[PDB]
Write a protein that binds this ligand. Sequence first.
Ligand code: HDD
Ligand code: HDD
Ligand code: HDD
Lengths: 223, 223, 223, 223, 256, 256, 256, 256
Amino acid sequence: SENYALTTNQGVRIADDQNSLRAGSRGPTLLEDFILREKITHFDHERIPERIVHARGSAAHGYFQPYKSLSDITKADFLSDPNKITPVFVRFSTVQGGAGSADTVRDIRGFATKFYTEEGIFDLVGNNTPIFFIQDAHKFPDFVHAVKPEPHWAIPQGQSAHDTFWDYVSLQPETLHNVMWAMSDRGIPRSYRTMEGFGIHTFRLINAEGKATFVRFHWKPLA
Amino acid sequence: SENYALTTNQGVRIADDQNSLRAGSRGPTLLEDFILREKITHFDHERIPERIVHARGSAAHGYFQPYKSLSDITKADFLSDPNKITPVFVRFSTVQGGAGSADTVRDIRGFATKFYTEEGIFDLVGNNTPIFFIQDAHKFPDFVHAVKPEPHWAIPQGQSAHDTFWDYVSLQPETLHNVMWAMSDRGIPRSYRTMEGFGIHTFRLINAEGKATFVRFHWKPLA
Amino acid sequence: SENYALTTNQGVRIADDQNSLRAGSRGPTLLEDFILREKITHFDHERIPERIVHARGSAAHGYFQPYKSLSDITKADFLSDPNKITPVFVRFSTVQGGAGSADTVRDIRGFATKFYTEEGIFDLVGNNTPIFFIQDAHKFPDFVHAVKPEPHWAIPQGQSAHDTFWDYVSLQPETLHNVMWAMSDRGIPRSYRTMEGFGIHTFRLINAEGKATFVRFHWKPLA
Amino acid sequence: SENYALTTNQGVRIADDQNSLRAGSRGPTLLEDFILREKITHFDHERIPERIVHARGSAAHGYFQPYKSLSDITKADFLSDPNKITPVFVRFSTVQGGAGSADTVRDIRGFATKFYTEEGIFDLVGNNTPIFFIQDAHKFPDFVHAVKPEPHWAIPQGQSAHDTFWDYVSLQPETLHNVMWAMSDRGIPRSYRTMEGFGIHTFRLINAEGKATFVRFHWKPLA
Amino acid sequence: KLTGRDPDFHRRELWEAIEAGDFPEYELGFQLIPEEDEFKFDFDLLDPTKLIPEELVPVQRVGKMVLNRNPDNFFAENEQAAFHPGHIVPGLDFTNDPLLQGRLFSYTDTQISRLGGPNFHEIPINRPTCPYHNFQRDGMHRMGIDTNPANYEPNSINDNWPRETPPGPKRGGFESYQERVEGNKVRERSPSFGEYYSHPRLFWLSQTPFEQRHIVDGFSFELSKVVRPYIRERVVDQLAHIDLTLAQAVAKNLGI
Amino acid sequence: KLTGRDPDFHRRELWEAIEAGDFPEYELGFQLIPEEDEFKFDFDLLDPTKLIPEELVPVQRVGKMVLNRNPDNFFAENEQAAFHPGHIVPGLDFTNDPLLQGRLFSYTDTQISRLGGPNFHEIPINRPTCPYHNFQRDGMHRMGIDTNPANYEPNSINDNWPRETPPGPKRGGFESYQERVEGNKVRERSPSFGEYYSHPRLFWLSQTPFEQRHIVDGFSFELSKVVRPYIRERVVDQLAHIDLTLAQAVAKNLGI
Amino acid sequence: KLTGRDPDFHRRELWEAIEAGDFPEYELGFQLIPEEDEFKFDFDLLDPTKLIPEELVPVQRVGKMVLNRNPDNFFAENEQAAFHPGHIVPGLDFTNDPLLQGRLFSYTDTQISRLGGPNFHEIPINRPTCPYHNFQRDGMHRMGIDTNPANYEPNSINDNWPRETPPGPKRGGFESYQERVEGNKVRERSPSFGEYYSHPRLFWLSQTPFEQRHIVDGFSFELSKVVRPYIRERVVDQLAHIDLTLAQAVAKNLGI
Amino acid sequence: KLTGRDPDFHRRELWEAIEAGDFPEYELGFQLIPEEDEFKFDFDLLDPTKLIPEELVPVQRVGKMVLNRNPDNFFAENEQAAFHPGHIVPGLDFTNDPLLQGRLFSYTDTQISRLGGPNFHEIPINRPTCPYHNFQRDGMHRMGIDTNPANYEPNSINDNWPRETPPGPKRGGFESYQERVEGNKVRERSPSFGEYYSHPRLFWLSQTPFEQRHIVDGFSFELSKVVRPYIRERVVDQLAHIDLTLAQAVAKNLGI
Ligand code: HDD
Ligand code: HDD
Ligand code: HDD
């Protein structure tokens, strides 16, 4: 929509972006072709590490506003007045598979929300079921390793359907509750647009007087 | 198959790999839990960038030996005697999709061989069709960006079937030849064991007298 | 000069920036003290690698203009009109010693300048003697290794006065020219304000007709 | 001491390590000179970030043994038998200055020991004075920033003698004790060989019965 | 599987909805519990493998969220986005939920390699829209050029700015709720967490007979792909402590 | 698509094949062309979009490769492996094929971020199995501990070892074939590369009527998924400069 | 300053002494305090700005350490070495000293950037010499190739190996001492840490008249290089709460 | 040495000057030589161990440069600045100087580890002030959020923008000078670079008697610190081929 000249990143207009500089049109590529190496270098370093879990996601910008001042239970700005509009960015995700795995797999999904409040960024990072698999964070890597492709051959992608996962489940009964939900139809939702969300943990709301209230976050879809 | 103690990476025997250190069983988790943070830290940095292209691959160790000395056409040690065994590592791959994308997609396949010769490592890095899409390295990033998931929404995974690809093909007739092979049944092979391999480029063989011979590399499956 | 609240990088006002969160004033530090970790994390990760060479430097901003249009010998914008002002950033340096070595050492000096032209960045990377030590870039890592602190003990800092430097010099006569300069008083200049500069290499100037002229770059100090 | 061929990191013997590959001995360097770029690439990535503090150090391998079993006060293996020799690696350092800074500065020194025990690595990481500058870790970055070169111009190297340091001391009396020691002669020791060392913190020894004994670590030089 | 037809379905459906105008909407609700009801339940509030049932504590409608704008660049805004539950604001605070506690450490630590260092916040999609200022400095890819004469605090050279700010009703600094803590230093699972089956059961019991068939199919398809047979039987075995029908239905499909 | 049923199929078959003992086998053969035959063909030898036809220059069988062991750890050995065509040995050498020339720069460069620096050859899977010694030092995650008094050459303090090795019949140092080079510094495609249609034609022409149907379906299916219609036509248009039947068949399926 | 003559003096002296055969020697000594004496002192044991006086708690000779070998490569061994005080072993444990507590976080976290990732223990200088095994995998520059069918625990497929080990007299697992903790969650300095001047004073008071001159000179020389004059006077002011002679002497040299 | 009194002297002086107002000034001057005079000299123009003597080619005053402003933040601006000679603009071009040629590869490579990725141009002090656009995407720490429907070219979906620009008198594209290249692929030093001693002796011969004493002192001080005696003598030996007096003055000081 705005016609600029194609440049190097040092802002040098490029004449020919279809060839390398060589010695004779049939000759060796010259090291001094700094425009080539700049293009390639960049291409060479495009990728960054994907997330350890929830690699696979889709995101969108939006906004939020409360129904009425919740000042009574919490002193949190973004919730203090129905006229305060908070910007938000939201990513939905699967869990096991990588960046280039499939959306339509049997799995928990994530539903994370970044709230750019006026008093700091608030991150609400939840899944689409009301509980999780394990109780202590120390067990995270064991579980995740169990669910994830197996170490010898890297199979399977986006599936809890191999031995380790169930070996872990079969010896860690705490997992059964979420596994239940996983095997339900909540485990293969048909869109993010019709998905539930939970913060799983009991958090605290603290009002202006320092009165603590236990809370648990839900997101319900109005679609 | 050998029975060792579970330790930190510093060699320190772990006694309870089931719980964070906290104050009381219902208490907060203590920063001094060095066992936890080592475990979580390592989990936290498990991932590394995937390849820019051919992220998706499968490999295996093997070996190679020649039928007869080629000493007459090349002074290369690994080809100088049928009794010389050279170890190899081989990786087969798709091109477009990520580490977690599907195997069975329509796409070019990589077929890379690392030869551990006595006179150095020789990597023969080819695909499964005898030619490439483009003529000058300088368009690589353009063609690749075009075939890749599109930049606004990152769709599709492991498919040339979208605009940018055929936009580019359409405007870069050079690509037609490979595109032909890609739309063929070679573009959707049924196993790596039955795949062809080509180094595509013309290389040189150099013998003990300095005589150069042009060469092209082929891998032909005996399965 | 402009009064703001002290916050986390997430813009969250901090109350007490004199303590860690702990269970009781004499108790263990709590892992949930996210303000601490943020602070320490960034502190933890403050450093980046220093330059391989010329690690030791001081720089300043400024500007440049040409005495008259050089349009006759070169189609370079930043030189094409004495009214056009180009911003510059200039970095002076030693060669051998690290980011934290002494300024006042016998050593070549670097004189590098960034010209932010309207037709790209032009970097003119030079030293304070009119020639270098070596002829082919391939030997760089050799000569640098030889002048740098020796590999077994890391000594000395900012000195060419040890065996490996002079071993190299004795077997590489090409160096003798720049060695001479180095051993002169230009090797221990009393300030950057009174230092000459040289681009050392013969470069080219290309005018709008594609006439080429060989050039060498000189900075002369007017103070 | 043992004569091998010069090679690339891929084990390919080098014939000429004095020139790049060019077109004609007076021609431009070809991109295909892979021996060059490997050599330069390695040289180009030689440096890694220095330590945030104690960047300047000197270290040596050694061993340790206890005078008699301390099994009465601790179950720690490396202290359980005078015949059990533990290998060590010990790094002495300054605090403020960078890798290439000087040794003979007025500063606290580090005295860090790595004990390779049969039951794990134990690192005893001390300084040369029995106390530190500050009481809570949360202040570390503040004080360290205070003593470090100042932000605007990066002066001075290896000296507490500038504003920020004494600004910070003057408004944080807690530091006065260690500041005392620094200004003493312990702050300009004459060799690491004749230096004292301190763990500073009170730690715990735990014996086989679970009895806890408070401890403080000392190193005394017998030289 | 729509995993064969369109591996990107959900990604595509969301984007295409926002294009068309039917913005996804969500209602944020809170289950609230007063501090003193903490122990009034069949289970421990801090155990994350347990749900608070809605018929005991109802979900209170509290706000509306609308997603109206697909990002411009997937990588720059999606991929590089950094969400972390420890990122809270005054008015909120954590509890000793042991899953949550560990989470708190990880989302910070994992950015350093994933996004290249401690200045990931300077990336557009993660940057606060409110003012942020401290004495941190440097780090890979620092964009912020600090003019403040001081990089420490307390400091007098800049009149100690930026200054901390005491906790308040609005625009207050952050101060943790002073929860009492009592106990020994221990690596130990709270015994109140040690009941694993009655939540699974309550869930199954409230599924329509055809929803229940689906869960049997889920278990049966997955367990079937498990190579080691004894793993299959130990799961089914566990399933029995949940509900005999379920156990058997599945057992039948796998032959036990 | 087996992309729905099993997204790991190929990975899985290869592994299980090797487990079982049916070791995939491959024959390496060379197409060989003497130096002087460089310009005796319809097309340019250094054009990586043109194949050397087998009936003109036959593929000579040259050796057998056998894959007989799966790796032990996928990440460690598979993910971390680095292959690069610049990695050749004495007896081999390049040509000016301008697609390969560029490649030569990239496989090296891209390791620096992917494997975290210039010591990637120290990771086991990449480590040569022959001797390697040189004067490179340091770099991130350096494993080799060097005992050499010298880190430069020439040096006299270690008698100049490791020493260079002059080129020879066997065990020689690498020297490049002294190809004559003549021409101007130019960014410009060789006009000999200028023909894009006859290879694609030769290819089609030698496909069985039912292979040809498949190719039509390929183009058809893929083009059908392109949204902008004109792109569709422009492609077919090119298809037309190749063979009329193909172009039409496809065009019919998209309706033009 | 020898900072001019030889900026490497100490580094050189240590190396050259080892070369020569006079290996530096050190005695490791403990100050020991039974748990129940924790509060019998003028000051708080967990305050790292306070020393335990030797005449109250003597330093007990406990072992001898000898440094007898310079490294082979400085970078590989010295520059890459990683020290962290959180690296203790069974028989040792920490205390709530709030400087040490924070310390415990930092020496781990900083390794990830400085040494390139979480496999830094795999570099030779940092590698344990005893066995180490666990279920961690991957991460940048991974050297260890894992053959264990499992990467998790509990696991049945490798019989749950490697197994955890209970605490015991020797060769036991690491258990933390079960210290009682009782407090509210607070960011607050312990009032027992509130006294800043008598340790300084005790220190000064035990210095020979000529050491005492030297301290003055140190303070005088450093404060002399301070630009802002008031900072000068506030320091001297604090000196004043330590000992009047000291404060004055230094005041004299800077003119107040 | 002032390396002992003030290790930061130059750094300090330069800053304090600009503070005060005496801006350092510099006159850029070009030595110019018409293409055809390339081989009219005693020596090779492309040999960077050789200076073009002013009395043959005078230095032509061409510009004035003024440093008038210290940076705001040393790290952010000094440490993170990235200078590279390959960074040129239309009107300038390189030559076959084999030192420069290699230089051209390194200043780019090295930024990737030093500044943590290929977006180092996005850091403020390196960011151009003119427009920059291309089809490059992503990379660690990406700041620019691209809105172009196309990340490739040629592309029809954004009318091929950003478009290339043909070379022109002003605002033109960069095209390299079509220097004729002739010769074989070889690793060989041009014989024209093979004379080492006459520029050194031209240098020595033009120093005042007291400047010459200084040079002897430099050489003498340095060589006195070399441990291995034969290195001393070999150097002095090379000094001989330069001028006998120099050689002997120095020899005397070291005893030969
Ligand atoms: C350290 C242990 C750990 C624990 C116990 C949890 N997580 Fe997590 N989570 C991570 C560690 C982690 C992580 C590895 O730190 C990730 C991966 C990449 C990242 O940036 O954060 C992450 C990411 C991540 C994301 C993706 C960010 C996005 O959508 O873009 C979601 C939605 C969740 N998590 C959800 C959860 C939920 C709902 C948990 C409780 C049931 C949970 N995580 C626990
Ligand atoms: C210079 C840009 C460029 C060009 C023109 C080519 N490549 Fe490439 N190739 C890369 C750039 C690259 C890369 C970005 O450098 C990759 C991606 C990740 C990596 O490590 O190397 C790679 C990888 C890569 C792999 C993965 C090897 C593995 O790790 O298993 C294979 C099989 C090929 N390529 C095959 C080819 C073929 C057959 C080409 C044309 C004849 C070709 N590449 C051209
Ligand atoms: C082939 C390698 C190589 C060669 C032949 C040269 N350089 Fe270089 N130079 C580098 C490699 C390098 C480098 C390793 O890339 C540096 C260090 C850090 C950086 O970013 O670039 C650098 C930096 C560097 C700097 C620091 C710029 C600054 O102050 O920020 C100056 C002033 C010079 N060089 C000057 C020269 C001169 C006058 C050379 C001619 C002999 C020369 N370099 C050759």
